[PDB]
Amino acid sequence: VPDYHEDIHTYLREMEVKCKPKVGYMKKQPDITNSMRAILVDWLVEVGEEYKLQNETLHLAVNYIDRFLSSMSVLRGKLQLVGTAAMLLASKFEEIYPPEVAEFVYITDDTYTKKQVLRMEHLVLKVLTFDLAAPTVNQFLTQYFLHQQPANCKVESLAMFLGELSLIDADPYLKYLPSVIAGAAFHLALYTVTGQSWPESLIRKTGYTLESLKPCLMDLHQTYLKAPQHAQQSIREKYKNSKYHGVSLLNPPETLNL
Template sequence: MNFSTDAHCGSHTSKENIPPSGKSEVQQVQRPRQRTVLGVLSENEQRGRSHSQGSQFSKHSSVTDSSQLTFFGCRSSSSFDVYVEEACEVVLAVSGQEVGSCSADAESEGLNNDHAGLLLELSSSSCQDVSMQSELDKSLMSGEVLCVSQYAQDIHWHLREKEVQLKPQPGYLDKHPEITNDMRVILVDWLVEVVQEYDLRPETLHLAVNYLDRFLSCTALVKRGKLQLVGTAALMIAAKYEEISPPELSEFVYTTDSTYTQTQLIHMERVFLRVLAFRMAAPTVNQFLRLYMSIQPVCPITENLAMYVAELSLLEIHPFLQYRQSVVAAAAYCLAIYTVNRNLWPGSLRSFTGYTTAEIDPCLSELYKLYVCAESRPQQAVREKYKSSK
């Protein structure tokens, strides 16, 4: 797979909540020679079968253990299509809720953090980023402070309200017997590669994963052969919502190596919008993180590290879907600022968000574990993206 190595790690602000700044340049994309095809994502079928078995593959990635899955590039079948009527009936039958109204009731209780002492040296004093002492180390977000300062609190509380209403259900995979957590991890990793190749914005990726999780939360019995189609539709909708010049429909079909047709992708888009009730303005970790960095600027290294660990959190349902997006963003901010400068949750953000260090600690501990083991994971798209000097 020959993806572009130029990572788009610059600053960007959601056009709905924070006024945009700067101009965006549309870059011409060169198609790679090879393309990874998810096709049928199967974990259960691998057990008890050798790698020599199976039918014809168009492209696949070899596995050495059960943690890595084989991609079967097969043509989709109309018998596996997810129709609007079926999706609506499933939602009403299973959850008793209207389509598009899936949300979590409340935050999960915080987990005991036995390793808090290893992560942070807790302090009650307000610590400032040492980069604030130098003009050369000003945050990439510092220019946006004046844009949002007048409305920052209103924006924050609006996002906090919406994040509860538009939160996916942590246990939604129980309603999809053919889809496993490992399949979702591989799909999200593939979405990161597509976003990187077409130089899309980080917010587009975060929105796509949010749409994916909410769609699977509100439906049931999605076939594994349609999982990549669902993910591609989620990314296409997110690109239309967020990007100035989103890729064409044919480009999204091309990313799947024409495993699905344009007609199937358009049909899945309609299903998506019906199931999500056209509620596309979902708060994401990226939005909260950028708002926090506008209130309390940090150096570019800290900013990109925070964005990196925030994108790592997209790979895992457990435990990160049990936390609010604002809490995950706060944990990413804390982990980045502590790693670079050994500082803690700033007093300005403590008063702005109402979150104390103790409330952030459980999510911070989980994010730290994901951060330290990222190098050993089979999915490396996020790490490769942030390896770029850009």
Template sequence: MNFSTNAHSGSHISKENIPHPVQVQRGKQRIVLGVLSENDYHGRSYSQGSQFSKHSSISDSSHLAFLGRPSSSSFDIYVEEACEVVLAPSGQEVVSESYNVVAETTADLRFLTELSSGHDASMQSEQDESLMSKEVLCVSEYAEDIHLHLREREIKSRPKPGYLEKHPEITNGMRVILVDWLVEVVQEYRLRSETLHLAVNYLDRFLSYTALVKRGKLQLVGTAALMIAAKYEEICPPELNEFVYTTDSTYTKKQLVRMEHVFLKVLSFRMAAPTINQFLRLFMSVHPVCTITENLAQYVAELSLLEMDPFLQYTPSLVAAGAYCLAAYIVNKSLWPDSLNAFTGYTTVEIVPCMTALHKLYISAESRPQQAIREKYKTSKYFRVSLITAPAALPFHE
């Protein structure tokens, strides 16, 4: 798996004057993660990982990686539209409870079988804002309808918190590294924060509806998730060859296109998923905050993408409320305003558990091996909010 932390500068781009895609400079060597030994693979968590330097190749067995290793599993899988079938070695279909299956093409079946086997840029505006802009969200006559629609949709587009149980070769630590890498790619190609949030949602939903994906295929899944999210959200998404390049050509164009095809089928082409970022911007349009608080809330929201537990147990709207409250408390010792209480129906008591988890994550961010989000928010563009020290305790019992 390959990482890049190169940043690229570019001129401000407006929607009215969109230039041709700009190819990314490729002068620096991309980072390669080594292969995890079998013992380390079963025992290591993300918190025991090592810091990866920006210009080094790591090939020892002490680091997490998703490069292909022989599979001990004798099962292959086929998934279609959130339904799961595990194929036994004899070829007999074993259907999980509460699942129904409609087979598609032989090519799709073959590709998903390969996925569970060991085989085988444009510059964007400096304004990192979702296409669902504040100008749209703050229109009073639509705000409540938008909020109700997002709250309904977030339930239908949630991943399953315990989905890694169906993927014995993938650990939580591997997912943390993959999300950290996606953050670096988003930064490198100057993509929007909403693109990152969508990509992580797609990744988690795909893995929720599949089984037995091999560690050597995890980066392919993540890259496809980001490519689809960029096509959905960006004005000028990076070209296919740029996504191949981000993996240091670990995967071919053909593999990535096939992965995209299956990915969309598994998610039933339901790509309009409400994200933490969307809810956060909606909340800040209803009750505006200062620029420092706004960027700090966005930083906290992105940190939550790293952790499945406990944040997949909360809805995106509740995580957004927790990020809003934590940022407001850190900056000016306020919490959940009455206006948002009335608008969302959430009370401070309901938000406290998620806010407490976010506070612990915020405090531990500096000592974690994956630093892409923290480095991003150290820049002047985000007012260096990741350098703000959080209070040791919140104003209620943790």
């Protein structure tokens, strides 16, 4: 327990700054775009569902892709190979048993070789300087869920859903830290289910006021409204499972009452 909850949260706050990607990176990518990055992340969410991977694995993979794309320019023909080695590395970090390399080749429809994927694994670690223990939205939400006043596993699911949705859209969501994304998602999911709001516990722990969250909340409210319409659907189709209380069936509030 809690002998470490405060230390860890503070330190997760330190680490998130050091594991920030460059925000304006996509505009310096010649061959690739926010929209192609959205294809890739959606696809990872499917791959994660196919091989029953944890949600952390997914967020970590997305963090690797962004930091790597911050320093390294990549042709479209090679983005998915970047994605696949990110997902391998994340699984190796986070999973108890990772799917074998072969399976990572298989899920691209045999377009890259095992040896390619392994050589890209190597190159991802070099550019990341073996720094793979990045804080995610998923990590922050889990700590936040400790401060839920009665616990409510529809709120929990619905926030997870929002946080995964932020993975998909680089602009706007790269401008926000994971700890803020998660503040937004938590409040949003809270609000939506019970009509309550981002609680004082967490205001004093995080030092975030509702109103400091406001901008991120506005961006995430829109995504939440627009989700049915988005080109990318894997996360919505993931969150209809009874596993997740089909929170993605639920009804977004049309106003936020700020």
